[PDB]
Ligand binder design. Structure first.
Ligand SMILES: CCCCCCCCCCCCCCCCCC(=O)O
Ligand SMILES: CCCCCCCCCCCC(=O)O
Ligand SMILES: CCCCCCCCCCCC(=O)O
Lengths: 281, 99
């Protein structure tokens, strides 16, 4: 399959002397790292968040980040201070690596400006996004022909340090990343869709890992009209999900929510509706 | 310059049982730029000591994040999430409705 590590940076430039930097490290969609802007240090969120890396080499990484954040910010401020009507504006960066079975690791470094793609690091070249403006061509030119210390560092971080770190991180967090957390489920009666209609609701909460299957059922017959919400986070590193169905007042009887999740070991949660107001007795 | 309005979803970690402690969540997502004001209200007054996850963004570069708190529902306590953002002419309130 596919596995990745990445850093995100969020730079908000409010005026020529006020900007804000934040960022964070991620194992696919699991956050593993914070950044303390105040002190310029890495916040290690889990007890395995150092991977197999020595404190020295993490401390070297943290200093290389401090220099970068201050330097990138100051260079942006130098350009943009020549026109104060450009403010406010936002730059986002996503940088890291991705491994595919049997391949060399692939590195990425992608930049957005005010919520659209601006430019990206493609092998050893910085390349303006399709529909390249003036801005994006100017920056790539500056990066390709006069910040060569920069490009080499970047290259080596995403192509060699990141994969190495990534694999240490997965090794040390093996237990935690593959753990299983069983969900609970419950029903409720959501808002009336119309005259003699009911909205049936099935909540599923506290599940990990993320993949999950929820349908309304009549016996073996999946109910076509089932609507899956988005899978939303809880604050204890689990997930949440509602599944709804619009039914005739009087067709609800016999219907059930069914949940399959990898933590349940084939023993699906099945909740039958009704006959009380909100799917209870 | 692109701007995107936040989506706002409010929900509890557990089914609400009056007098049982629980977690109220307000997930704000799909927004741009990142500057945003989020509050949890209890009867229309803001709760202090609200925690939130570190700011992040999706593949389309829009931002998201989770605001949450310990709380204890009762029959006649109303809880909501109030959001302010430059795309919104006025703050937007979404009510926790247990359903
Ligand atoms: C905030 C995250 C801390 C976690 C440390 C993990 C170390 C692995 C390195 C990953 C490479 C990310 C690319 C960062 C881009 C900054 C470029 C530069 O420093 O000049
Ligand atoms: C100087 C070392 C710190 C990192 C420098 C990155 C420079 C990025 C170029 C800024 C582009 C621009 O503002 O037009
Ligand atoms: C290491 C490469 C980082 C590239 C960042 C490019 C930032 C572009 C900023 C544009 C500033 C402006 O609005 O004038």
């Amino acid at each position: 399959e596919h596995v990745s590590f990445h850093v995100i940076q969020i730079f908000s430039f409010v005026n020529q002397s006020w900007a804000r930097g934040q960022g964070s490290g991620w194992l696919d969609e699991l956050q593993t790292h914070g950044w303390d802007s105040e002190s310029g240090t890495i916040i290690f969120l889990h007890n395995w968040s150092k991977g197999n890396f020595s404190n020295e080499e993490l401390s070297d990484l943290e200093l290389l980040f401090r220099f970068y954040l201050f330097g990138l910010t100051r260079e942006i401020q130098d350009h943009a201070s020549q026109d104060y009507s450009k403010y406010p504006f936002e730059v986002q960066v996503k940088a890291g690596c991705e491994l595919h079975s049997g391949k060399s690791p692939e590195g990425f470094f992608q930049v957005a400006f005010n919520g659209l793609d601006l430019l990206s690091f493609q092998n050893t070249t910085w390349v303006p996004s399709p529909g390249c403006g003036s801005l994006a061509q100017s920056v790539c030119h500056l990066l390709n022909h006069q910040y060569e210390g920069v490009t080499e560092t970047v290259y080596n971080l995403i192509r060699s340090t990141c994969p190495r770190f990534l694999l240490g991180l997965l090794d040390a967090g093996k237990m935690y990343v593959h753990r299983q957390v069983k969900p609970e489920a419950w029903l409720s009666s959501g808002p009336s869709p119309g005259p003699g209609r009911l909205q049936l609701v099935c909540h599923v909460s506290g599940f990990y890992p993320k993949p999950v299957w929820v349908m309304w059922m009549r016996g073996e017959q999946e109910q076509q009209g089932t609507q899956l919400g988005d899978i939303l986070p809880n604050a204890n590193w689990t997930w949440y999900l509602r599944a709804t169905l619009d039914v005739a007042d009087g067709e609800a009887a016999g219907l059930s929510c069914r949940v399959k999740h990898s933590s349940l070991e084939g023993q699906d949660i099945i909740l039958y509706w009704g006959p009380g107001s909100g799917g209870g007795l | 310059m692109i701007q995107r309005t936040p989506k706002i979803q409010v929900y509890s970690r557990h089914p609400a049982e009056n007098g049982k402690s629980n977690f109220l969540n307000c997930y704000v997502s799909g927004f741009h730029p990142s500057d945003i004001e989020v509050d949890l209200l209890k009867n229309g007054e803001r709760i202090e000591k609200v925690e939130h996850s570190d700011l992040s963004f999706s593949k389309d570069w829009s931002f998201y994040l989770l605001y949450y708190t310990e709380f204890t529902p009762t029959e006649k306590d109303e809880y909501a999430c109030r959001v302010n953002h430059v795309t919104l002419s006025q703050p937007k309130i979404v009510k926790w409705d247990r359903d």
